[PDB]
């Protein structure tokens, strides 16, 4: 697989612009066109979020991940495993 990749998402108006689903892992389920996660063209639906702002999310429940993303602030550093 492609090596895990570090991405910085800059939050803007009203959201980070992506949804998540998911030990089973946290996966991108939706990327909003024109939104903060669409701008760099890096993340895609199906990618696994391995970390947010230094916090390992490989074992996170959906709730734990959603908390971590909602509290990561305006600058969100993600390590993603491309599908």
UniProtKB/Swiss-Prot annotation:
Domain PDZ, residue spans: 6-83
Tissue specificity of this protein: Brain.
Recorded disease: Intellectual developmental disorder, autosomal dominant 62: An autosomal dominant form of intellectual disability, a disorder characterized by significantly below average general intellectual functioning associated with impairments in adaptive behavior and manifested during the developmental period. MRD62 is characterized by mild to moderately impaired intellectual development.
Family, per entry: Belongs to the MAGUK family.
Role of this protein: Postsynaptic scaffolding protein that plays a critical role in synaptogenesis and synaptic plasticity by providing a platform for the postsynaptic clustering of crucial synaptic proteins. Interacts with the cytoplasmic tail of NMDA receptor subunits and shaker-type potassium channels. Required for synaptic plasticity associated with NMDA receptor signaling. Overexpression or depletion of DLG4 changes the ratio of excitatory to inhibitory synapses in hippocampal neurons. May reduce the amplitude of ASIC3 acid-evoked currents by retaining the channel intracellularly.
Domain notes for this protein: The PDZ domain 3 mediates interaction with ADR1B.
Protein name: Disks large homolog 4
Species of origin: Homo sapiens (Human)
Organism ancestry: Eukaryota, Metazoa, Chordata, Craniata, Vertebrata
Residues of the full protein shown: 308 to 393 of 724
